[PDB]
Paper text:
Here we describe the combination of rational and computational design to deliver three-helix bundle (3HB) peptide assemblies and single-chain proteins with control over topology and thermal stability. First, we garner sequence-to-structure relationships from antiparallel 3HBs in the Protein Data Bank. This gives core-packing rules, including layers of hydrogen-bonded polar residues, which are combined with surface-charge patterning to design complementary sequences for acidic (A), basic (B), and neutral (N) helices. Next, AlphaFold2 models for both designs are used to seed computational designs of single-chain proteins where the helices are connected by loop building. Synthetic genes for these express in E. coli to yield soluble, monomeric, and thermally stable proteins.
Based on pLDDT and RMSD, two BĀN and one BĀN′ single-chain designs were chosen to test experimentally. We solved X-ray crystal structures at 2.10 Å, 2.15 Å and 2.20 Å resolution for the two BĀN- and one BĀN′-based designs, respectively. All confirmed the three-helix bundles with up-down-up topologies for the B-Ā-N/N′ helices. All had consolidated hydrophobic cores with knobs-into-holes packing between the core Leu residues confirmed by Socket2. In addition, water-mediated hydrogen-bonded layer of Thr (A) – Asn (B) – Thr (N/N′) was present in a clockwise design. To alter thermal stability in our designs without compromising the 3HB fold and topology, we sought to destabilise sc-apCC3-CW1 systematically by modifying its consolidated, largely Leu-based hydrophobic core. For this section, this parent design with a single polar layer of Asn@a, Thr@d, and Thr@d (N-T-T) in the B, A, and N helices is referred to as sc-apCC3-CW-1NTT. In our case, the core packing of the parent design consists of eight layers, with three residues in each layer. All but one of these layers comprise solely leucine residues. The remaining layer is a hydrogen-bonded constellation of one asparagine and two threonine side chains.
Author numbering: -2 to 95
The structure:
């Protein structure tokens, strides 16, 4: 679970960095293409992913401070981060196609 926790922290950190980077790419698309509803949908999704990542970070913090972390909480965190990785990959593609 130590290895598990350490790995989830690195995954979370990489998702935060990728998601922040996509905010600058989206803003550049907004300057280039104007205020389309398509870009509005991508901004909303980027914001939601950042919100979810912030919430998960609080749960990771609690588990790190726990002297015997619940394996179920760890597994649930692992699943949620896996979902956000896919969602962030799909957004990376969509911004690259615009």
């Amino acid at each position: 679970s130590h290895m598990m926790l350490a790995a989830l922290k690195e995954k979370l950190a990489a998702l935060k960095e990728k998601n922040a980077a996509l905010k600058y790419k989206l803003a550049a698309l907004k300057e280039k293409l104007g205020l389309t509803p398509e870009l509005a949908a991508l901004e909303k999704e980027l914001a939601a992913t950042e919100k979810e990542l912030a919430a998960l970070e609080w749960e990771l913090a609690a588990l790190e401070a726990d002297p015997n972390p619940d394996p179920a909480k760890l597994a649930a965190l692992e699943k949620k981060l896996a979902a956000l990785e896919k969602k962030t990959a799909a957004l990376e593609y969509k911004l690259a196609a615009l």
